[PDB]
Design a protein around this ligand. Sequence first.
Ligand SMILES: *[C@](C)(O)CCC[N+](C)(C)C
Ligand SMILES: *[C@](C)(O)CCC[N+](C)(C)C
Lengths: 540, 540
Amino acid sequence: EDAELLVTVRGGRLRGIRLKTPGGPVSAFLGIPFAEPPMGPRRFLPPEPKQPWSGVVDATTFQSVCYQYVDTLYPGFEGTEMWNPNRELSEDCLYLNVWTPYPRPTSPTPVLVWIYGGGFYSGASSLDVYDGRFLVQAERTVLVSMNYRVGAFGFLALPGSREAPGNVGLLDQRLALQWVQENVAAFGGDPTSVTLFGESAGAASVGMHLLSPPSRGLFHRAVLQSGAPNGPWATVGMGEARRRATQLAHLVGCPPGGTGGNDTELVACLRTRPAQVLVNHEWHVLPQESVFRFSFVPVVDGDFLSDTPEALINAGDFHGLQVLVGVVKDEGSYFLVYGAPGFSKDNESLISRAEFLAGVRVGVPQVSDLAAEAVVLHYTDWLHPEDPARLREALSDVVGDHNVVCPVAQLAGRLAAQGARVYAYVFEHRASTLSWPLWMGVPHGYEIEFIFGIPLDPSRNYTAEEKIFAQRLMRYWANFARTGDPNEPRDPKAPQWPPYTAGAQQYVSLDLRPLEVRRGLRAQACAFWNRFLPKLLSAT
Amino acid sequence: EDAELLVTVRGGRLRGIRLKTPGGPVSAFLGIPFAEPPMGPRRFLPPEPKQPWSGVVDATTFQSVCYQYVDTLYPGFEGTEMWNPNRELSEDCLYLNVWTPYPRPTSPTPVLVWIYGGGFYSGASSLDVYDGRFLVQAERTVLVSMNYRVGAFGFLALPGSREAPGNVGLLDQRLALQWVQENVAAFGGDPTSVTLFGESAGAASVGMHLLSPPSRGLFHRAVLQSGAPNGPWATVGMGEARRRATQLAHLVGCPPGGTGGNDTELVACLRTRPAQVLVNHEWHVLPQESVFRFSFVPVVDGDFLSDTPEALINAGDFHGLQVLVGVVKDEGSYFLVYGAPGFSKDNESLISRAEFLAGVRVGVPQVSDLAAEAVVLHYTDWLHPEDPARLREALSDVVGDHNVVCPVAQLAGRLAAQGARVYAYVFEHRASTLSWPLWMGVPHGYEIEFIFGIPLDPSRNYTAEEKIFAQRLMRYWANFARTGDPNEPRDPKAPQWPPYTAGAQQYVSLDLRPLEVRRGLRAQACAFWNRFLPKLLSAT
Ligand SMILES: *[C@](C)(O)CCC[N+](C)(C)C
Ligand SMILES: *[C@](C)(O)CCC[N+](C)(C)C
């Protein structure tokens, strides 16, 4: 009844809310504080645990969105506005949400924990597309999602310093995972069966938690959707992080004219600026014209990450770990309208050969001219070297392979070969409701609405076929959370999903059709990025 | 009658011989001297015209083969010994042959001129596979073939010197072309319709006559079979040619210690050595272990070739010229048993990954380690990187593309785009009587027997379809010699052979099946060789 909407955790008491689905109600607890508000002197600092509270905290609505840039490339457009903040911006933003079935499970239930993406500069657990009511109702799992600091507030780093150590946004997620260990049982959740899953920068975050010992003990399985910690955008070096932090300070008048610039004076002036002032100059610190590059991302400082993600992946022992990874069919098309010449969401973007060669430098920033020539060689159809439609898809492949597909395939191979049981997919269904143009195909991030069962929302215009498809994917994800295996444990009727191995490299297609097994996640193109191109740059 | 076996040319009188074919007789004049014997002091010197003679020169049998290395890799094997000399060796070797139909044509007839291949170190016009009786009988054209000096006797060069200028083997071919201009009318041939055709080094020879002005006026059409002058094996630099000539002299005791060693005394000692002694040290002057590399080849001296074949091809006007070029299906397989580790003609040659990587250095000599890495990346199937059968076909593709297909495709594109009418083919029929192993496919040089109508020989075990196939190709070649177009000038029955363009890049498949049009002469692989790899070697 209404008694299940009242729960006591270690910090105090909560009152949740009942949410409706076509198949039955679920109990939600939205806006649970898990940290002290990182404000004033606590800006740029690691999070502190939320101190216990008196009375009943209201947990019936989502809390504030962490301060972040708001996309304005296409005002009023659903394809961009769906990722923008849908609550008020505030630095008081470290809250998490818990969905649990109705009636509350009497047996400990496996827990899914969602980490949203957004290039480490944006995102919120309150987005409509992350609504966990349908996944929890259909599969009777427990779902948790948290907010974490993005942009300068989460990843501004002056390495070696104590006022701005960096990676505090990743520490926000870790504290939320520690909160799950200590409190998810009160909601009927099993803290010994916790499955991480995230998309884009959230998938990279999941990967970085795999490679950080203090976080590895807080979960047991991982799902990386369209992202990996070894991507060229997910990390930066200490020197580059220091340069970006210093230029942001310069752009907001820090330090004042006539003042020294050691790390303590720099962060002190930085903490006096309004949060919106820092956001308004975030993009002006990138070193080049680029797409798929973000200003403040996790830093390789030796603390949260002992080494580079690439080094820790190669030297890692992953025995006893189950991972589910995958990509969408058109990973790069979304990012081309954000800087690549000749591209527009409101036309066919039939680019010229000259625009393609210029776009390669924007899609692959800061590589030698010879490196770009190697990219042009592999991604040109030399029987149709100037066909605009082929050049449009080629540049989409350049950006997608370089940033997502090949970093993911590299991670998946090393994981399977070093003890982990791995499953791989490629998402190939384009939503009937998709507002982005047709030439973008299945863009980055548009499998999420199907994983979360959004087609089940009666207020939306999805097809009957898409609803069955969403239930299939929810079963896959929940089966993996329960058993580490997406296949139905006692259903041999359905085509089986074989594990991914470094040799066979098997993955399955996810669309309206039944499962189909394929081999190689762009093995030819990814050999160029993962094997030859590094050798080309070391020889300059 | 027997009257047609008596012909007078500018040098004197000749007596020919009548040859039988299943379709009727032809009149052959074998062993016509066109040059003074390049003996003694004339070794390494350009040819001089044959002085007129008294009486009737007997032209009823083939003359001597120019001194050359004889293959002994597989003693008694048909696949190798069919290319070995079938007449005695001698420096007295500059003779040509003329086949003409019976009855002799009363109207001027198009003339075909054959230039044999053999890596510029071997070959002879007397080889059984070059028998011109079937082509002349079936198509009623005039066929001419000449001997030219090979090895050191034809291409040893101390550039700048007058005792050994180099390229004298090419001058041998030119003198034979001047002979055709002055005497082929006596056999019923049209000196205004002369079509050159050759294979391998002969095709490279045809290409070098296109790029040499003094020879360009001696012919009107060209056919390049599995060879091009821009191949990495067909030419050599002045400095490298001097080094090879000097080490050959050293290996035979020139200069005598301890006397000087300028170019005149070096050649003087060289001219005293027996011809077999020079041949016995020819292979010991190559710089490294390799396949598809030959010691003494045309040199870029500034004389016969004013610049590199690549430079002359790019800056050339080819309006008013018709060219027919093509390759066989497996250009590289023949050469792998001559040095590539793990290869044998008497087993399946299922090489290992380590053998493939070592073979790449042999198939592509004198390139940086990074260049070899780029070759390995492009020719590895990264879904089956260790499969022996795929590695075997990959190394054959490496040697074939690098040496034949991509040099030919580069030449064909530049010619069509700069005025020449071009036709392209890929020969895909493997002879039923082929003694090379099955894994070699259609090896380098095994379209020749079909062009010359050898299946028509009743003493051979060719199939019925292969005889019709040979007649069809003989018409293609003769139609091109007559009109510059391999297609039938009237017949719309058979599918048509479209010209080759730099854009559409259309070519036809030559096999038992009717003509099939395809696009791209291995366009993707040849972009690596022709576009990217030169840039990779520039930046070391
Ligand atoms: C990834 C780098 O996090 C990109 C995420 C972009 N959205 C719009 C899909 C969140
Ligand atoms: C080409 C380089 O001349 C090779 C010719 C080899 N034969 C055996 C086909 C003549």
